Write a protein that binds this ligand. Structure first.
Ligand SMILES: C=C(C)[C@]12C[C@@H](C)[C@@]34O[C@](Cc5ccccc5)(O[C@@H]1[C@@H]3C=C(COC(=O)Cc1ccc(O)c(OC)c1)C[C@]1(O)C(=O)C(C)=C[C@@H]41)O2
Ligand SMILES: C=C(C)[C@]12C[C@@H](C)[C@@]34O[C@](Cc5ccccc5)(O[C@@H]1[C@@H]3C=C(COC(=O)Cc1ccc(O)c(OC)c1)C[C@]1(O)C(=O)C(C)=C[C@@H]41)O2
Ligand SMILES: C=C(C)[C@]12C[C@@H](C)[C@@]34O[C@](Cc5ccccc5)(O[C@@H]1[C@@H]3C=C(COC(=O)Cc1ccc(O)c(OC)c1)C[C@]1(O)C(=O)C(C)=C[C@@H]41)O2
Ligand code: NA
Ligand code: NA
Lengths: 532, 79, 80, 532, 67, 80
């Protein structure tokens, strides 16, 4: 449980610099791994994860003096690149202990900066941030994956002002004339890399990342996504929208002019209209097959966890279900069952409502579509359950009261009471009962209770309008557009290389060795009228 | 005075029971009016499902809103 | 968005209808628009098979339309 | 224009103490009246009113040293009780210059207190606050009339902690045991007096008083009104409500069973039902006459200015109009015109809606009734104008399009288009036209524009829901209840003296002379857990 | 204005608490497991020489300041 | 409904010798930024006559803070 803990860990925990100094002087092993269950993540038990090492323990506890001693003592220096059983180094541990609170973010940022400076000074040829843990994540990738927006924000626009540490910066100042200055953002492992770019990690999160909506608001990421949109993806997205418009028009035309004789499949007549009809049907089935395979590819690549399946990946599910209805329609069509129509129309309806998928790329319409999606996913079940409880209760009461009437059934009475909700309730739809007072009292009570329900729905949804819905929907729309951008880049359709944006600029030209550093920078201009 | 602002669900269940028992009495009294009682109980029997929305945060909150709407505000506007 | 929903469900319903009195985009679009103004018949035709499909489409259209209007209300309230 | 201005006024204006001292030493007249048009209220011209006297000029300009010198010089002491052409003294002038701002209220309060102390010291037998101006108003009554809530609030709970000034206080501390103490408020010229009590002045304001809603929130007034309600007026108000319920029930019964034969008046048949009917009719006419004379008495006593007529005095107008409809019905009845029914039903409808008058006395119901009243008075005309513009425009277009149809008239087409607002629009109500596309386009445009109008009405009214409507309606309800209390006290119905509340208590018993002062004080218990 | 949401949430919490207490009072099978949180020695130094077991509830917290 | 006094008592911790036993909140251990504390639960979970949970839950509705008293940390966590 406490396996691996030794006196050096105890000394660091108690914040006793003298005891740590004596223990290191007396031959304590500064690389000892406290790999007991207490020192692991272990969400189902109490504990504290810090990287299992004395150096990462000192770093995680905001003890800079002990870190400086351990790294560069006289007897046994600590290995700044050491990895624990998970593969995490000190920087990975510092990312892990972040929780996006103010003081935690401040001290974690400061400790991260100090670790980088000391590592560069002691080991100029060591690139700490390129070291990956057993999951293959760098500290930047780990911060992006875990949603540590504070540490991510610090790293992305990190600028270090001192000699022999410029190469560690990721934000550079290219020039400054007056109040205007032009800065450069590094974008290594953000735009693209071998395994885990920041954009890929954020966009393809599992929806359990706490700040997936907010991480994209960090300046270089938002500007990079807007640039990618305007330069490369806008035209391709509009072309896809146009093609989908043509597909849905052809599907609507083919379905509208279906033959009405029974027993499909139908013989092709030697006439122009039927050649157009069968061509449209073939194109409709082809598009359905295309969306079917696209949905399968998406689900295989992402592997949703059946809870992230719906709160994310919503549009992919809708397109896949549309294709499923299309394929079931084809199977029923060739099975000589008229019921294929029942499938086809559903696909047709879905095929038009999925037009809302393309509202992303338009800020306001995309926000409205996001509101619709989240209302369906979050709020619909609660209100529909309560409304259906009231409807079914009063329908059962009324149909029990009715004796051998025209209605006298759950379906007819439920529909007739539902008509009150749409402003079409008759209120005298039958007289096949005794106790007219009971009938009218039940209907009036149902009407009043239904209006109470709808009024409470309105009030309850108004509780979230205090700046929450607008900003939340806007950020969700931005995330959806980012996902669209990344998918479009992955497809790219013509083996084009212009998707690699921001050009190849020289930051310093003086690395720790005599080589230069071209690092694919992105330029951002800013104006500051104070702090001259 | 605390009878309705608290203990609301207990009253609704008790009133459902009262309608059921009146229905039984009318049934064995050879009065068709028992149906008039029974249907009311039936209606209440379904709306009392809202009692079980507690244990679900959002649904329970919505049911609480309905309860307080009826108890607090309904009489003023209906008058 | 409203016209997208209206046209999609109109196309589905008119496709479902066979040789009816309505049986056209104009008539079905108008008849579904009547739901928005509180005049939707909900049984305006029987010239179809699969009554369950017809009623399911109409109920889904009604619920989605009320969701649209409610979200429109909330979105405009966001700026008040 | 500058008539009456002397060198002393100029010296005070320039804030030159030395020049004022020299001028008074050299025989300047400290009672000179600067009664030029520039120094009067004169809302249509520039100027500055200060009371026309050097003493009130110094007081209004926040120059306490000059006030002390003028009152306590050696050569010619200023007359602290002097009155200007309007009859205003220095205290009236200080009330006049108040505008309910923070700094103005602070310095006016301080100057008022200092002048009272100086007047008591120099003239212990002089009661400055009992001096009335030409309008008959004391400084307290003037503050209440003009809506100077800051000065009124200061005066009503004024307490002066020093010997030989206790008699000037209006708030007195009866006892204090621990954190709990009992205060006594004076009530002189608040509960009742000869000419202008504070309650009468506030309640019967012309609606131009800026703070008539807020002045009643000052502690002694709110407590006194609640006490008056609970002790005296609650039962009488409920009795009046019950009597009005009986009156409306009798009127409804008499109107419901009217005979259907033509040509009134109708012969009384020797049968029980007709005796009850004619008795109910006689009682209905008697009540109408009663409300008619009550309305005339109200309008004669108050004399509304035809702008305050509607924004205030709303319920009195509704009751008077009900009585007018009743009397017109009687005249038509005996004139052998069946049109009397047309009048009677309107009165009947109004007779029931005037039940809302009695929602005062119930906080929430009264607030809701106030919301209804203010929505009708303030907002209805704007939205009705815009809606009627749209309705009439589209009705004229549609009826012009219709050619020799069954509708083919402004009334029928306007009614059919109005039906869309209530969820009953046919949308195919006629086919007597050419250009069906034009007809349907006009109707759809009308529907969409009408929903836009209603939605913008909703948003515009929501624009004022940020704590304004609730608090404003609550304060208006409190004012209405105060008016009801005062009217009930004025009626009093049995020559009862119990309306004089709070009992006759001995506040100090040590006036400037050897007399003891009983001042009819109101007791309030307060608890303070700090400032031991 | 932020009032009805929080008020309804707190009322729901109170209603659930009432449900919990009623369920414990019923308990349906003469079960004793409803007495939770276990018997722990808090201090072990009472005013006399005895130790105190007080049936305590364990809660973990993290504070990144006041080291 | 004296929520202030209730909140003070329920999580009372006294840091001095010879008065530790009076504490109802006790710190079991503290490793680093994380620590584990113990709440007493005496007369809260159960007792002879009037437990805190029974008193709060079965109030007459005249208790001013019956809604808010359950938000005190040990009670909310215990109920969950
Ligand atoms: C959530 C699931 C996947 C869902 C899939 C189908 C069955 C759907 O019924 C629902 C259940 C339902 C039924 C009736 C009213 C509301 C909700 O809602 C959606 C789903 C509900 C929708 C709502 O419309 C939209 O969400 C459009 C849309 C918005 C945002 C998007 O990012 C999007 O990407 C495709 C699409 C429309 C239907 O697909 C449709 O057209 C038919 C015939 C039924 C609707 O199931
Ligand atoms: C408040 C009293 C006890 C009440 C009891 C009956 C008669 C009731 O009529 C009312 C009066 C009424 C009638 C019509 C419209 C609104 C209110 O409302 C409730 C009461 C009103 C309701 C409202 O539904 C609910 O409150 C469900 C509910 C919500 C929260 C809960 O904690 C709950 O616990 C059981 C139940 C439904 C009826 O019981 C019902 O189904 C019938 C036939 C009439 C409703 O009287
Ligand atoms: C403002 C004037 C005096 C008014 C007087 C009459 C004609 C009235 O029509 C109005 C015009 C009107 C017509 C139709 C809809 C709205 C407004 O509104 C009121 C006035 C409008 C009302 C509104 O109902 C109320 O104001 C009740 C009420 C609320 C608060 C009160 O303090 C109150 O004291 C009596 C009464 C009801 C009518 O009197 C009524 O019952 C009939 C037949 C027409 C209404 O004219
Ligand atoms: Na309607
Ligand atoms: Na309707």
């Amino acid at each position: 449980y406490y396996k691996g803990q030794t006196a050096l860990h105890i000394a660091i925990e108690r914040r006793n610099m003298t005891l740590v100094t004596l223990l290191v002087e007396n031959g304590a092993d500064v690389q000892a791994a406290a790999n007991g269950d207490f020192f692991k993540k272990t969400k189902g038990r109490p504990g504290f994860y810090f990287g299992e090492l004395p150096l990462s323990l000192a770093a995680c506890t905001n003890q800079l003096a002990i870190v400086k001693f351990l790294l560069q003592n006289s007897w046994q220096p600590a290995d700044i690149s050491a990895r624990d059983s998970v593969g995490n180094t000190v920087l990975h541990a510092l990312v892990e202990v972040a929780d996006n609170t103010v003081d935690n973010t401040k001290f974690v940022t400061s400790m991260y900066n100090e670790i980088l400076i000391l590592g560069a000074k002691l080991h100029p040829t060591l690139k700490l941030e390129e070291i990956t843990n057993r999951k293959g994540l760098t500290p930047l990738a780990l911060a992006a994956s875990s949603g540590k927006i504070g540490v991510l924000a610090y790293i992305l626009q990190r600028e270090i002002h001192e000699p022999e540490c410029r190469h560690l910066s990721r934000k550079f100042t290219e020039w400054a004339y007056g109040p205007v200055h032009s800065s450069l953002y590094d974008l290594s492992c953000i735009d693209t890399c071998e395994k885990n770019s920041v954009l890929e990690v954020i966009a393809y999160s599992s929806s359990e990342t706490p700040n997936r909506h907010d991480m994209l608001l960090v300046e270089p990421l938002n500007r990079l996504l807007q640039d990618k949109w305007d330069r490369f993806v806008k035209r391709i997205f509009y072309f896809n929208f146009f093609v989908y418009c043509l597909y849905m028009i052809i599907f609507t035309a083919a379905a509208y002019y279906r033959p009405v004789e029974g027993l499909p499949p139908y013989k092709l007549k030697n006439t122009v209209g039927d050649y157009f009809r069968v061509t449209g049907e073939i194109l409709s089935v082809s598009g359905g097959v295309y969306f079917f395979f696209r949905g399968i590819q998406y689900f295989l690549q992402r592997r949703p966890s059946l809870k992230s399946l719906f709160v994310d990946s919503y549009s992919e599910i809708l397109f896949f279900v549309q294709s499923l209805f299309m394929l079931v329609s084809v199977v029923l069509y060739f099975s000589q069952r008229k019921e294929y129509v029942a499938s086809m129309v559903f696909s047709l309806a879905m095929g038009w409502t999925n037009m809302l998928y393309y509202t992303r790329g338009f800020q306001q319409m995309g926000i409205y579509a996001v509101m619709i999606e989240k209302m369906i996913l979050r709020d619909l079940c609660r209100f529909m359950f309560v409304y259906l409880v009231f409807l079914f209760g009063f329908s059962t009461a009324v149909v029990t009261l009715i004796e051998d009437g025209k209605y006298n059934s759950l379906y007819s009475t439920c529909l007739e009471l539902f008509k009150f909700t749409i402003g079409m309730g008759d209120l005298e739809f039958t007289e096949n009962y005794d106790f007219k007072a009971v009938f009218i009292i039940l209907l009036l009570a149902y009407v009043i209770l239904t209006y109470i329900l709808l009024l409470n729905m309105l009030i309850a949804l108004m509780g979230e309008t205090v700046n929450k819905i607008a900003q939340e929907s806007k950020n969700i729309w931005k995330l959806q557009r980012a996902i669209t951008i990344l998918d479009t880049e992955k497809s790219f359709l013509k083996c084009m290389r212009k998707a690699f944006r921001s050009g190849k600029l020289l930051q310093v030209g003086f690395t720790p060795d005599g080589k230069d550093d071209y690092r694919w920078c992105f330029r951002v201009d800013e104006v500051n009228w104070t702090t001259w």
